[PDB]
Ligand binder design. Structure first.
Ligand SMILES: [Zn+2]
Ligand SMILES: [Zn+2]
Lengths: 362, 362
């Protein structure tokens, strides 16, 4: 009945926009075919809708954001229940829409999203690779459209007046390329050079204009912090990573999120993390910084307000460096190679941070 | 000197044949730029050569086979030493050339081969994916040509009349696609459906017209068979897998190769394996079969001649099935799900195999 629920797209726009040639400079349009179901899979679809947009700036008008607005208004007209949503989208999401959908998923325990993409948008760009990882960790199931999914989208959203779907040549080849790329970038870990370049606690002398953040999550179970292997991550930056962790999916209780950041939080990130740990009783925050970031502004107040709101703040030493090397780096068997005076630089930085956070004088 | 050692190719044939657009139906030519070095990496190249060929049948004339013949004649004109060879090839090897190069590498302890490919030939085809895995397990270092390697091959093998290399657009994008594809197919494990369909020991009633073979290797160390995690494998067939294991890179001593095959060896594979274990004192062979293959011919003599030449022959039971599920299958966390009457079918098959191998009557 999906065909009765939607205003279908015509064939010559489907085969033009869902052609899965991995590189396709010219298609600056995005098509998103959405269907909504209840949690029982036997059940038929409650509703479906086709959203269109452009791929270029002002992303508030991208099909994903239009879906989010539509879905928010739609859920208010039906009795509250659990939903499983499926997208067939011609381009994978941009970085901003990835963040939006991801934080929506991490905050909503009654929504399951499966995104099928025909092509990977900017698959060569590290920012979009990270965007896909963010979507996946929030819990979106990311997949490349295969022949079956193109056939399904033809049958359900395209005015294919009784005609069957007929694949273009090289559809399976394109799928193989795209699926390998998606798998690789989903499993990607930090480059060793990126690690040692960014987490080195010797005083800045070049580059390092980006901040890298690795994080792990633990739950409590009979007064012992038990790890959650499956919800770790690492992010590169130039709103707040705690807004992308789906705490409602972990084995419910109390949580301890441990942070390892190459630069200590800027003012606004300390503010955002303080906001979060203030409005989330059940989440503890432990920050470990490799270097102290002196923004020439309000960074000290930011760190102090983060510390007052319950977060533990410290500098990385050998232990945390080795942990991050063994967990978040594509080290390839090779062991952690500490630099000289790592411990002494870490101790000096700890003294500086202690002075920063100290409230009462002695 | 690489440029003085070779008869360089002209620019437009280089840019025509080394363009790395992953799909390129029309280029049925292959170009292979070869250089040879000593074990010392500082040392300059001893010799270099450009081989040309066509991509279609009669593979005896493929650039890889031409290199093998040339290299065999070349090594006889220089004092015996260790060699490191580098290929820049426009298409990855076909299945036959993959087998040839792999068995050459696995039998020669004085040769190191690194193959850089511009494009993956038939990357969508399971046979060629397996071919690449075979090349890698024999010890060839398989890699996709990146910008640097195209530049190097331009500088060393192309009559680039003083001009520098200038990349086409989408060279890094194509590299990203191809490198992800190569990585994934190098790491690929057996599909769960493929496994349970092919290793089921209940009597054939359809499909199963191919035989699947997984294998592991162990070395001896003070009378304890210690495994070699890094030299496992699995192969699909419709000459002999023991000719593709590089028994000279493992920590030398005596070896035990354990085989798990969905069908018991045909006559010619039993013959090949008997030949091998006869001419290789230091290698023990342990075969485990899921079903007995009755070729309507000489299979019983083949099995008995394999058994006389020292091989252990048996039928798989729960233990071996679970081992193969846990080792060679992309099981995705899920556990080995035995079928009903697995043990009883295995015991009956063992009785029939014991009648086959029995020599003296009682
Ligand atoms: Zn967007
Ligand atoms: Zn060939």
């Amino acid at each position: 009945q999906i065909r009765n629920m939607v205003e279908p797209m015509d064939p010559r726009t489907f085969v033009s926009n869902f052609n899965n040639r991995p590189i396709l400079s010219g298609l600056d349009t995005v098509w998103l075919c959405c269907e909504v179901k209840t949690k029982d899979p036997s059940g038929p679809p409650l509703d479906a809708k086709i959203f269109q947009g452009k791929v270029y700036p002002k992303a508030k008008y991208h099909p994903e954001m239009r879906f989010l607005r539509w879905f928010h208004k739609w859920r208010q007209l039906h009795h509250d229940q659990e939903y499983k949503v499926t997208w067939y989208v011609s381009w994978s999401p941009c970085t901003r829409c990835a963040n939006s959908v991801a934080t929506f998923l991490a905050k909503d325990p009654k929504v399951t999203l499966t995104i099928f993409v025909a092509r990977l948008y900017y698959f060569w760009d590290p920012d979009y690779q990270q965007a896909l990882r963010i979507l996946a960790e929030a819990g979106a199931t990311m997949k490349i459209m295969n022949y079956n999914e193109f056939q399904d989208c033809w049958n359900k959203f395209v005015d294919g007046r009784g005609k069957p779907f007929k694949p273009w040549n090289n559809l399976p080849k394109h799928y193989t390329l795209l699926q390998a790329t998606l798998g690789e970038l989903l499993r990607h870990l930090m480059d060793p050079g990126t690690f040692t370049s960014n987490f080195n606690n010797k005083p800045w002398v070049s580059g390092q204009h980006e901040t890298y953040l690795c994080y792990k999550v633990e739950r409590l179970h009979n007064d012992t912090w038990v790890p959650l292997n499956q919800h770790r991550g690492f992010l590169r930056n130039q709103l707040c990573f705690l807004d992308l962790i789906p705490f409602w999916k972990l084995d419910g209780q109390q949580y301890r999120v441990t942070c390892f950041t190459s630069w200590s939080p800027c003012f606004s990130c300390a503010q955002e993390m303080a906001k979060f740990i203030s409005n989330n009783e059940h989440v503890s925050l432990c920050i470990f910084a490799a270097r102290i970031y002196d923004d020439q502004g309000r960074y000290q107040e930011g760190l102090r307000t983060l510390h007052r709101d319950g977060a533990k703040i410290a500098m990385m030493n050998y232990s945390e460096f080795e942990y991050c090397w063994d967990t978040f780096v594509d080290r390839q068997g090779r062991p952690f190679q500490p630099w000289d005076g790592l411990d002494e630089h870490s101790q000096a930085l700890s003294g500086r941070l202690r002075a920063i956070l100290q409230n009462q004088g002695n």
